[PDB]
Amino acid sequence: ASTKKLSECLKRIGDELDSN
Amino acid sequence: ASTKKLSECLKRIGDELDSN
Amino acid sequence: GGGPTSSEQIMKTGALLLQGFIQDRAGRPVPQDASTKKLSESLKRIGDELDSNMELQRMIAAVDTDSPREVFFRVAADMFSDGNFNWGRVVALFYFASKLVLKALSTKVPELIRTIMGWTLDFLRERLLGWIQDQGGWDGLLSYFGT
Amino acid sequence: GGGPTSSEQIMKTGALLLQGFIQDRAGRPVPQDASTKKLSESLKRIGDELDSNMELQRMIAAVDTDSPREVFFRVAADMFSDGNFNWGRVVALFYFASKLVLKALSTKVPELIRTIMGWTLDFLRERLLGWIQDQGGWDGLLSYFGT
């Protein structure tokens, strides 16, 4: 159920990272 | 084979301890 | 041999990087070349920054990991379901793989403590209990310690 | 109820002490009463001193622990085979039980890293490799990091 929310959490971490 | 030597090592630690 | 673009080199370096990265975080050694060592450094410090991302830890903490293989493939598929790729998501996936190792260990531990306590208490009942009774039980250990 | 000498109290307090002691050393919480807390304190600091006994660590390091149940009963039997008992040997046995937990975990870890690396590399081959090739392989990650 809440794997969904860690995925998004990790997607957004991924993108955050590319900004630098 | 070398369980033998840790036993003795733990026996002697045990006795050492009782001295105090 | 193939250059960096060959799938064989991609799989080789990927394993090195992945193994180096995970192992590093678990002790808390894999021989590798200079540019690969440089990537591993970058990986390690990014991993450090994410370890401080406190929301993420809670996020990682809440997922149930009794089926850790199911969890991994589900997270990985989702991370890449929108059809976009970037290096940050790959990094994030690696970080996630290393957390699974630690998470998985953490679920073995109580059962391990239970099994070993079983042995110890069984041995104690059958072999030491008589002697312990002769001391008046564990209060004798208080005396021994001089309490 | 029985006093400290009853076998029921001996087994009850033994489990508390044992569980408290092992758990303490593994994090690196079990509700218990005052005198039991005092014994646990004495236990914990003695455990600390043995952690510094460097010969003992090597001694514990060398035994193969692929059959950890066999190892425990063999050490325990031997410790008490001369028919003598004293509190120090009991303490030593507890210390040994907690080391088995850690030793046992340590043997699971590489296999765990292997299993998880398996998942990750499998996912990477089937799902990310094409994209990684488009970056010219892992050298692209060097660029990304600005190396």
From Swiss-Prot, chains C, D:
Motif BH3 boundaries? 39-53
After translation, the protein is modified as follows: Ubiquitinated in the absence of XRCC6/Ku70. Ubiquitination promotes protein degradation.
Expression across tissues? Expressed in a wide variety of tissues. Isoform Psi is found in glial tumors. Isoform Alpha is expressed in spleen, breast, ovary, testis, colon and brain, and at low levels in skin and lung. Isoform Sigma is expressed in spleen, breast, ovary, testis, lung, colon, brain and at low levels in skin.
Comment, domains: Intact BH3 motif is required by BIK, BID, BAK, BAD and BAX for their pro-apoptotic activity and for their interaction with anti-apoptotic members of the Bcl-2 family.
* One function term, GO molecular function aspect: protein homodimerization activity
**Is-annotated flag, keyword Electron transport?**
no
Please tell me which stretches of this chain the record labels as motif BH1: 78-98
Q: What are the record's GO terms for cellular component?
A: BAK complex; BAX complex; Bcl-2 family protein complex; cytoplasm; cytosol; endoplasmic reticulum; endoplasmic reticulum membrane; extracellular exosome
Q: Which organism is it from?
A: Homo sapiens (Human)
Keywords, A to Z, come to:
Acetylation, Apoptosis, Cytoplasm, Host-virus interaction, Isopeptide bond, Membrane, Mitochondrion, Mitochondrion outer membrane, Nucleus, Transmembrane, Transmembrane helix, Tumor suppressor, Ubl conjugation
Fill in the subunit field for this protein. Homodimer. Forms higher oligomers under stress conditions. Forms heterooligomers with BAK. Interacts with BCL2L11. Interaction with BCL2L11 promotes BAX oligomerization and association with mitochondrial membranes, with subsequent release of cytochrome c. Forms heterodimers with BCL2, BCL2L1 isoform Bcl-X(L), BCL2L2, MCL1 and A1. Interacts with SH3GLB1. Interacts with humanin; forms fibers with humanin which results in BAX conformational changes and sequestering of BAX into the fibers, preventing BAX activation. Interacts with SFN and YWHAZ; the interaction occurs in the cytoplasm.
Q: What does this protein do?
A: Plays a role in the mitochondrial apoptotic process. Under normal conditions, BAX is largely cytosolic via constant retrotranslocation from mitochondria to the cytosol mediated by BCL2L1/Bcl-xL, which avoids accumulation of toxic BAX levels at the mitochondrial outer membrane (MOM). Under stress conditions, undergoes a conformation change that causes translocation to the mitochondrion membrane, leading to the release of cytochrome c that then triggers apoptosis. Promotes activation of CASP3, and thereby apoptosis.
Q: Tell me where on the tree of life, at the top rank, the source sits.
A: Eukaryota
Gene this chain is encoded by: BAX
Q: Which family does it belong to?
A: Belongs to the Bcl-2 family.
| Glycyl lysine isopeptide (Lys-Gly) (interchain with G-Cter in ubiquitin) crosslink residues | K108
Motif BH2, residue range(s) on this chain: 130-145
Q: Which GO terms describe its biological process?
A: apoptotic mitochondrial changes; apoptotic process; apoptotic process involved in blood vessel morphogenesis; apoptotic process involved in embryonic digit morphogenesis; apoptotic process involved in mammary gland involution; apoptotic signaling pathway; B cell apoptotic process; B cell homeostasis
Official protein name in the record = Apoptosis regulator BAX
